[PDB]
């Protein structure tokens, strides 16, 4: 269900986005961003350093993480 | 302004020493005050404060040092009339309390504070001493005219100072505690200490 994407990057950060099914999607907060504790409690599976760095308004069910090099 | 101020003073002088003026006069006064506050009336506030202090000092010139038993018959009546007339005055200059004393002092509370400056005078210790002398009819004698004491007591309770202490809350009985309750309790203790043993040395303890 939890669909991941490849890594694409510029010279300074490395990014990733993740798509979620409906049930997890309907929980994402519309007000504040998240923290690693928070999205691990959601059910993401990835490393240390990934930061949830914005929300795309038209489609809330897509998360965007980035981390430095 | 000025041309307003003289007639306002005349009307205020009328409202103290009350002769039950007619509502036409009071609408004249209220219209004067409202007209001045539209043209932001600090100087009018200064005039009011000064006039109150002056009149109260003039009154205190008389009635000072009547030594007892009239300082009550004086003080209670003066306080009663002053409180009532001041309530009326707060009624008149009521446009201030809504649109300039919101940026800081309500006229009623100002009058109370000025009467407090009439309390921190020989009118403080003499009154309490005379009241204690009156209650000294604990022994006997129904001369304790309860209305001659309730007036002073309620006056103390009310006079608990309020000028931006915190804001209108409720019973501010600081003044009562610190200026009348103490002496009352101490003198009660002393009087009972005396008369108790005085009786005790003469009778079987049953009595």
């Amino acid at each position: 269900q939890i669909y991941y994407s490849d890594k694409y990057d510029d010279e300074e950060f490395e990014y990733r986005h993740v798509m979620l099914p409906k049930d997890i999607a309907k929980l994402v907060p519309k007000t504040h961003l998240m923290s690693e504790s928070e999205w691990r409690n959601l059910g993401v599976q990835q490393s240390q350093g990934w930061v949830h760095y914005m929300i795309h308004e038209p489609e809330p069910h897509i998360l965007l993480f980035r981390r430095p090099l | 302004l000025d041309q307003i101020w003289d007639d306002l003073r005349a009307g205020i002088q009328q409202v103290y020493t009350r002769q039950s003026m007619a509502k036409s006069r009071y609408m004249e006064l209220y219209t004067h005050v409202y007209n001045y506050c539209t043209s932001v009336g600090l100087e009018l506030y200064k005039r009011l404060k000064e006039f109150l202090k002056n009149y109260l000092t003039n009154l205190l010139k008389d009635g000072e040092d009547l030594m007892d038993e009239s300082v009550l018959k004086f003080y209670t009546q003066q306080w009663e009339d002053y409180r009532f007339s001041s309530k009326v005055l707060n009624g008149i200059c009521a446009y201030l309390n809504r649109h300039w004393v919101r940026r800081e002092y309500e006229i009623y509370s100002l009058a109370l504070v000025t009467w407090r400056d009439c309390l921190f005078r020989p009118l403080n210790k003499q009154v309490t001493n005379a009241v204690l002398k009156l209650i000294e009819k604990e022994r006997n004698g129904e001369t304790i005219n309860t209305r001659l004491i309730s007036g002073v007591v309620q006056s103390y309770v009310e006079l608990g100072l309020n000028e931006d202490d915190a804001f209108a809350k409720g019973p501010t009985l600081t003044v009562y505690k610190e200026s009348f309750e103490s002496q009352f309790l101490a003198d009660t203790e002393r009087f009972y200490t005396r008369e108790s043993t005085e009786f005790l040395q003469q009778n079987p303890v049953t009595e």
Partner: protein, 321 residues
């Protein structure tokens, strides 16, 4: 009729019914209305959610007398050039906003009556925290994700800040054992809720013991992703007399069934332990201790202004939809 003859309190009462665009528009009518467009009673509560803006614009607006400034996820990537007077703001939200270090330093070097702050996601440094030391009235604070400052800075901040009610010093990605040690050593004594997650290889039982022995008033607590907390830490929390919502989620060193013993602390209400409990065994834990709430809320609340556009229960009147 001469409507310019209107008195100022009437004009203000009129203007207290508008919306920010029109309030701006009318300011360009005549000099008196220009004065009355900014009278420190219209500018109680601002709102600039996501709007891009400029340092001088926000400086002027704050100097006008704002109280509750809500500006989350807004972008301020330009240098501040003007000076001001000490601001009057009392609640400030800046979560996740992309701002410059120099601009943020300049802005914070004026506010001193901060009753509530947020700085989630941002990046700080030594001058910023040194200036922030002045705020001797911080009820709340929130520094999640921030990074860059130093131990001397942290200890000075925590010493100066005395009334700190809730603290969320979470997830920072440059800390050290020194950082967490000096933190817990100098934490104020009234901390009702505190978060210290993330610091897996820096949280130690000695420091947790120091915390539980210094502060007796923890009510909400979380230590997520801590990999060196054992059941001795367990009995540590047993000294806490007000822990109502603990969460040790993904604390690996804890064997699941000792979680049953947590139910034995009296004043507990919830326990979020995501990660450790194998599925199905959640029912086992529920049966073992059915007087609690396990895994009923994913999201934190420790000094988060918004969880509902109202910041911290306050309503912003001047807004932009």
């Amino acid at each position: 009729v001469s409507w310019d003859s209107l008195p100022d309190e009437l004009l203000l009462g009129i203007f207290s019914c508008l919306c920010l665009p029109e309030l701006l528009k009318v300011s360009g009518v005549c000099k008196r209305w220009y004065r009355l467009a900014s009278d420190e009673s219209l500018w109680q509560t601002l709102d600039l959610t996501g709007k891009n803006l400029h340092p001088d614009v926000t400086g002027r607006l704050l100097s006008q007398g704002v109280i509750a400034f809500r500006c989350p996820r807004s972008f301020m990537d330009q240098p501040l050039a003007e000076h001001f007077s000490p601001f009057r703001v009392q609640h400030m939200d800046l979560s996740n906003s992309v701002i410059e270090v120099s601009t943020l330093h300049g802005i914070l070097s004026q506010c001193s009556k901060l009753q509530n702050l947020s700085l989630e996601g941002l990046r700080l440094s030594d001058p910023i925290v040194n200036t922030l030391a002045k705020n001797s009235n911080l009820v709340r604070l929130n520094l999640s994700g921030c990074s860059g400052f130093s131990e001397f800075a942290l200890q000075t901040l925590l010493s100066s800040c005395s009334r700190l009610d809730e603290l969320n010093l979470s997830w920072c990605f440059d800390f050290t054992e020194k950082h967490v040690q000096v933190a817990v050593a100098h934490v104020s004594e009234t901390i009702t809720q505190l978060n210290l997650s993330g610091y897996r290889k820096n949280l130690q039982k000695s420091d947790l013991s120091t915390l539980v022995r210094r502060c007796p008033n923890l009510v909400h607590l979380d230590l997520s992703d801590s990999v060196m907390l054992k059941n001795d830490c367990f009995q540590e929390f047993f000294q806490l007399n007000y822990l109502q919502h603990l969460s040790l989620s993904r604390c690996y060193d804890i064997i699941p069934e000792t979680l049953l013993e947590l139910g034995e602390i009296p004043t507990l209400k919830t326990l979020q332990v995501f990660g450790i409990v194998p599925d199905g065994t959640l029912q086992l834990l529920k049966e073992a201790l059915p007087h609690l709430q396990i895994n009923c809320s994913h999201f934190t609340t420790i000094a988060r202004p918004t969880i509902n556009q109202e910041i911290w229960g306050i309503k912003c009147r001047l807004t932009l939809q």
